[PDB]
Homo-oligomer: 439 residues x 4
Amino acid sequence: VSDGVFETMDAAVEAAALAQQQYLLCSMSDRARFVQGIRDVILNQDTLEKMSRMAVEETGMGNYEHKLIKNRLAGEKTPGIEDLTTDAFSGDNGLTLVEYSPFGVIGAITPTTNPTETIVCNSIGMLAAGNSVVFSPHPRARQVSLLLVRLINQKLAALGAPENLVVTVEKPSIENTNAMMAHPKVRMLVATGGPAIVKAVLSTGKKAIGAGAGNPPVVVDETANIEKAACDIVNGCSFDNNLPCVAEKEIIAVAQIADYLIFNLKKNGAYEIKDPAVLQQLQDLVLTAKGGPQTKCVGKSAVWLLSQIGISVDASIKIILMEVPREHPFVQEELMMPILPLVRVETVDDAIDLAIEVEHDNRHTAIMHSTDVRKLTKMAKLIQTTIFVKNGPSYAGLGAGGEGYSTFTIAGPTGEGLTSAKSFARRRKCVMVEALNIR
Amino acid sequence: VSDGVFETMDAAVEAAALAQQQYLLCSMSDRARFVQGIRDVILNQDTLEKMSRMAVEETGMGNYEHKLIKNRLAGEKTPGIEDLTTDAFSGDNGLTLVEYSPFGVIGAITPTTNPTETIVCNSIGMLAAGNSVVFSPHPRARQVSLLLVRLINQKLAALGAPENLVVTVEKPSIENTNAMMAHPKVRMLVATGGPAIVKAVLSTGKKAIGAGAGNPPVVVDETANIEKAACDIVNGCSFDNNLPCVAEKEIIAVAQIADYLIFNLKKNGAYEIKDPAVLQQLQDLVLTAKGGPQTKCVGKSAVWLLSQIGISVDASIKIILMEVPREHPFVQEELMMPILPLVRVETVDDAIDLAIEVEHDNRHTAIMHSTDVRKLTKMAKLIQTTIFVKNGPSYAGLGAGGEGYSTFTIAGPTGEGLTSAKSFARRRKCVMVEALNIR
Amino acid sequence: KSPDGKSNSSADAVSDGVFETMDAAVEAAALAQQQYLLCSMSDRARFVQGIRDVILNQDTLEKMSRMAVEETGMGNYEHKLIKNRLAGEKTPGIEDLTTDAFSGDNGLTLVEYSPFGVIGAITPTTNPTETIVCNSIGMLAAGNSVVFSPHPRARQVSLLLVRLINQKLAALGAPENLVVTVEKPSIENTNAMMAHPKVRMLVATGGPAIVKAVLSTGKKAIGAGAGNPPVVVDETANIEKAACDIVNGCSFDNNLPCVAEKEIIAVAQIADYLIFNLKKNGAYEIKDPAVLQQLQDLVLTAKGGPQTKCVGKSAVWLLSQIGISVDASIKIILMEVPREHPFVQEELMMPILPLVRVETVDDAIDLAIEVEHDNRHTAIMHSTDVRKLTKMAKLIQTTIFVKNGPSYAGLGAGGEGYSTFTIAGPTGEGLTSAKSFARRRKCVMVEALNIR
Amino acid sequence: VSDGVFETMDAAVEAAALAQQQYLLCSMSDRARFVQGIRDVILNQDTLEKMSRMAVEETGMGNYEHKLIKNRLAGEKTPGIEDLTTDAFSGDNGLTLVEYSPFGVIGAITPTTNPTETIVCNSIGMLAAGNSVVFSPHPRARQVSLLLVRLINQKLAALGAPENLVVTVEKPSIENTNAMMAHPKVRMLVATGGPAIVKAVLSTGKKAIGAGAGNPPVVVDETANIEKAACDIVNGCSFDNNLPCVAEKEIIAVAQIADYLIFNLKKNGAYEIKDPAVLQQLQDLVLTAKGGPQTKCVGKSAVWLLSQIGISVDASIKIILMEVPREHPFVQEELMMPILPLVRVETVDDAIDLAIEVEHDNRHTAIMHSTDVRKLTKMAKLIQTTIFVKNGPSYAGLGAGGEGYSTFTIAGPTGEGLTSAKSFARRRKCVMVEALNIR
Ligand SMILES: CCC(=O)SCCNC(=O)CCNC(=O)[C@H](O)C(C)(C)COP(=O)(O)OP(=O)(O)OC[C@H]1O[C@@H](n2cnc3c(N)ncnc32)[C@H](O)[C@@H]1OP(=O)(O)O
Ligand SMILES: CCC(=O)SCCNC(=O)CCNC(=O)[C@H](O)C(C)(C)COP(=O)(O)OP(=O)(O)OC[C@H]1O[C@@H](n2cnc3c(N)ncnc32)[C@H](O)[C@@H]1OP(=O)(O)O
Ligand SMILES: CCC(=O)SCCNC(=O)CCNC(=O)[C@H](O)C(C)(C)COP(=O)(O)OP(=O)(O)OC[C@H]1O[C@@H](n2cnc3c(N)ncnc32)[C@H](O)[C@@H]1OP(=O)(O)O
Ligand SMILES: CC(C)(COP(=O)(O)OP(=O)(O)OC[C@H]1O[C@@H](n2cnc3c(N)ncnc32)[C@H](O)[C@@H]1OP(=O)(O)O)[C@@H](O)C(=O)NCCC(=O)NCCS
């Protein structure tokens, strides 16, 4: 049986195309079993700890126990075939049904920040909708991505699936990626990555879903539970060392509570920098001459980042915290590091205005800690982000401590929000004229 | 006050950008009032007849009485703000809400086959979802498009809307269209047109909705009500002179009812060509050297077409009918003329196979006449079309004799199905952690 | 196989709705509902629209509103104008009759809302015309006929409404007697309706006695309960808006409506600021114990119950009856009393609004749960704290909960959602609509029409 | 710790009142653990086998193999807390949420035909909705019911549930029932039983749901797959020896295919009686002179029934078939036995009219075998049954080979259809005025 890995992109696409044709002859029960099969692969404790541990060691980014939670989140709260609902309308003209049907072959680009959660997430959703998927993994995570694909192909083969429902290439590269985007038998492109690769898949003449970039602010006003907010903000900021694109990247605190917030942040493992000389070193380490993030510090722990400036702290420190002006490079930039600047503002209305401004119109993600229903409503409505989290860690926006399903492909410019099976399906309308209206 | 027509595409876009930002401050009541303004513009009897006269006069395509019905269908059955529904989940983690929020400025490309209906239905849904729209109409329908835009802007001014919610250019052209595709302030493209213009919009780096092409076959098996099927097939095929994208374009009939079906088709106004010489005359009239459809014949009545080959008939003749092999140009090509080839096949399973094959994987529209629930199920399920109509004219898939709403932007390649306000909105998730779970 | 297909050879003075006997009314409704099953959904929709036109016709709108106040002595013309129009515009139609679909390997399952048959509806003297408009739209949209047993105190306005409905439905080609009543309403006739074998379902909008009775008849019954809606205000509320909303909700139709505020439970640190804004919004505050006692004499019977002589009269009127003259800006009578005061414990249905001062927001919630007497009908809260709004709504478990608005926002007037005037109490249907008056049917197409 | 069994009805109601108050403070996650616990009890292979044969042994009704299927259906396909959905509506006036909330203590009356499945189905749905349940079981299934209640109380005790979530009485009697209906703390009665007990619970001054009686016809017309129809009809009629209240109980066949159907009926396990003397023996055995069914024969097998009249057949015989006029006692009566009268009629429309007539305006369950979508629509629309199955066995209407969920409390007069958790909840509406409209 094929393990799903192919030497060329064209060979993988052609096998996925044959596989999806065979897939159309499978029942919905087969789909459910295949979906459950993919959950069982990642939710198996040894494979969970293998994938989490293996991604840290090969990418050098993130940390092990947080990938346990993300990988389990993907396998547990990704919607299966139940996502493919049916609408019906019956009256004098008959019955109309609206269904979610497969697209065909979907090419899927996966990131080095969430290599396995994206594959688990994309695979389950795309296979639920009746598609086959070709993965072009990130080269920094190519061995952990390939191992997951091989494990999935073994499980699906064991469960009776057509071979090659989930395929990838042996040597991931952007050259294979560009061949995937050009291939006539790829009917849909899904890019989870930075804004360059998303613009690329929206330029190939075919249906594309692209993730978005975000610089998520978290506002805290005087009505918030400060103790809980500090716990949630540390947890959300240091989650997988600030790799997730929903992770908090600057605090905008109302002055009335800012100090007591900083106090409680420190209690939860924030390391506060007050010396501008120490702050200067950290700027020179984590930023280029550009002013933006430096790749070698992305995804690193706070303990690690601090050791590089000669400060030795134990494992209880999870984030590095500093109060700075709004113009500081750490607020304007999307560092993807557990370095959390705090801007002090006079009023909640000022906090909302700055949060909107600092969000750079990404319309991606924003967080607020407030119990005032009017202020929660006002900031949510104005900032207009794909995800908005009130009184919890940012990752509650993905189903970890918040209601709803989870995903690791969050659409930016294409508008689908948190993708699921439904997002990988074509809507069909079936009209039974003057019959089956049995009301 | 501005009338909506700008001299340059740049001026139209930026004015639409200003408008959409003002629009963001309006209530849902204001949207509902503006949506009702657009309906009133097109449903006013004088404008309704003026828009249908001008469209035929200016494009030469379609007929007045049927554009009267299609424009009214766009004004009455296009969804409004009630299309913008809300999802809610509540439990131990609080409340999650999912809303349909505005995109921004939408660039919409409109066809010469359906200029006013596309503008009416694009406008309603895009404005219901809180966007502004820049229209880039087809030059063959410039005068009627701009009048309709100016009428919309006038009525919206009377309603107190932000100026320039609906805009276009004075002299529409392909270069204005390309300027609209390139403009950074256009957040989404919507193209109702041929395969080329849909590939263009999917190659711009933006989100695009593309309403592709079809070759809708109609299968008639031995269990059908043949009398009713003949009436439906003529009515659907000839509706607005075969201009609509769903209109019947070739019959595939089981051999045992084929003759009786033809007799009934003739009974309902199909002119049958038996003489092979006359049939060759028609082929040379309506097909170019490369075998493609002649533009001068698109949307012409059967009376006109037959007159061009020396046959004089009265207004009761609605389509031209001919039995031919499956390889015949009228089968393989999409003609958009009330010319309806018939292909005779041995069994209903042969008919389904040929229908799938001749449809050319457009997965757009198919029609079946059959009272056999298993063959209806099999054909609908196998052919995987965006619209499938059972025992009805093709336009029962547009809300005219079938259950559901109407659209004139039917997305094949991009998978949205029958577009409406939802299709022109971003999806946003709002997570209220550990609160508002009042069950 | 057939060479010509399969044709469909087998597919092919006026009553005013008022009857001298309940049994003739029921029998006429039974025949009507059978004819109705031959009508199309389009017919249902024109008939539903025709009911809306009766009550939203400006003449009839004014006539029904004014006539109900003249006939009953309860309520006021301007608000019944608003309530009748609310029933006319925001009562769901046939769109309420949604279809559930499930498709997969075993085919297609459809779930539809189909007619019960003859419904007998008991309507109250408080909202005679709104309940009749609201029931008739919902019940006919679902494909039923309805027999009305109205209250004798509202006989004329109810018989007139049923007659006007029957005239309009006649003009629309409806089967006669889709909506009927009796010429002489009575408790005798109501009992006869509850007992009649051809009545498939009973819908009662009234007090607990009549709700208990319909649940004792051996047939399907919807019971629309009652309660004593508390309005809780805490220190996070917008007090200037709370006071305005509280005056408006309490004085709506002179505190008749099923949801109207009936006691304020105020957090002490904002209590006096609340009272100050309540008087600014048209509250007459009684502070003199002598005068407060005079009003108790007037509005309470010897048995400690409310005087029906005073139910639904304005605050102007009630103050005039104790020698206090005030102009039309006074909308409610307001007084601060202990939690056991009769005005708190009873349900007066009068624009009389006791305020009880408590210490914390958690005491306000506990008291609101207590004074609601486990009706779990309605409660209101003014508060911006998303935790306290959640705690109160979750704990008090009312059918309707309104946050930071007048109570009547729970019926579609200033709040999202549709309207109704039959709010189910014991039987748990919530805000009744066409769906509530339907049988749920399941049609299973085995291994066909799974076209996904 | 309590085992759930109480000496007096009042003690069980008083215990269940305290339990449900305690249940209110449990979480939705607790309910899900308690619902999964009940599924784990009945789906345990040892308990499943014991529950299915102890029911047969104590009641003398049904058969072992089929109760395995039915208890499996109750445990697997009964909806859980996911049944309690949430409606939201947002706009200028804010947010409105609608939720499904507990009633309190529910008194449930279970039948002798489906004692254990009803207890599994009721308690799962009632506990998902946040209720406790006092069962008042049928006296002849006393010992299997109390065992199930004890096993349930043991599992929940192991899950940390409040004591007495599911309770019953030590000696089931109808006077214990009469205590349950009168107890004021019982906020809702649910009677799964005959027409007397249903009228009773509807005469108590409380909210009541009541099961339905039906005389379910199965029409077969000349368009049906007769091989499959006969196989489905035998399997459906003999399912648990015709005990379920959806089972086929008279065939109304179109004459043109009647003899071919009887042929396939016989091949699938139907023993046809043709001799009128043998037929009269069967009536005296299974009927009284009142006309009513003999309780001694209810739920018995076809082999057992034929044995009493001296006829010896093997276990391949599943039902007893006889062609009779429409007025025959087996047509008019409701035998709940694997006895299947067949009526011959000329036309499918006569079959439909006869089906309607013989159903006795119960509007409960009806079946049709036909491939004509017009005739399936006509019969379904006109007969207005709570369940309607097309082209499958009766039990496909309960989710066994048909789409949808399963129940064993099918409402008759009270209208709720197939009960689930929703049916045991109060609809509450929460209105947030001018806030949380975050669209
Ligand atoms: C809540 C969780 C979520 O929301 S999931 C979405 C999170 N993932 C992302 O946002 C991905 C973007 N992240 C970044 O760009 C970061 O800066 C980091 C992690 C540093 C990226 O590492 P870096 O070493 O700079 O490489 P790169 O990703 O920028 O890519 C460089 C070139 O390779 C390409 N590339 C990217 N991914 C793939 C892929 N899966 N397969 C094939 N090619 C890939 C890029 O397009 C880029 O190409 P080029 O430089 O233009 O030649
Ligand atoms: C019924 C529901 C619906 O979907 S609404 C109708 C949808 N209409 C379609 O799918 C396309 C049907 N029309 C056509 O195919 C052709 O236009 C017809 C009328 C048949 C004849 O083509 P012809 O006479 O040569 O005109 P053309 O469109 O090919 O030439 C225009 C070229 O300019 C471009 N163009 C297309 N639309 C616009 C527009 N609105 N504004 C500016 N430019 C436009 C196109 O690129 C087109 O060139 P090209 O032929 O596509 O290569
Ligand atoms: C599709 C799957 C389904 O629909 S299954 C659920 C549908 N409902 C049923 O199957 C109920 C079965 N309906 C029937 O008519 C049964 O055939 C029989 C056994 C005849 C019911 O009649 P019934 O009088 O109740 O039985 P019986 O002769 O043994 O006498 C019992 C007496 O006790 C009563 N009873 C009934 N259930 C209970 C109970 N759980 N607890 C206490 N009492 C009960 C009965 O009313 C009867 O009393 P009485 O004869 O009226 O004085
Ligand atoms: C409004 C109210 C003041 C009625 O005025 P009233 O004069 O005090 O009450 P009445 O004595 O005239 O009517 C009640 C009696 O008539 C019966 N009754 C109620 N409605 C009836 C009807 N439509 N037809 C016949 N009898 C009816 C009741 O069962 C009751 O009988 P009982 O007192 O012997 O037990 C008040 O008593 C009430 O009934 N409130 C509940 C109504 C309500 O709030 N409906 C919700 C509005 S949407």
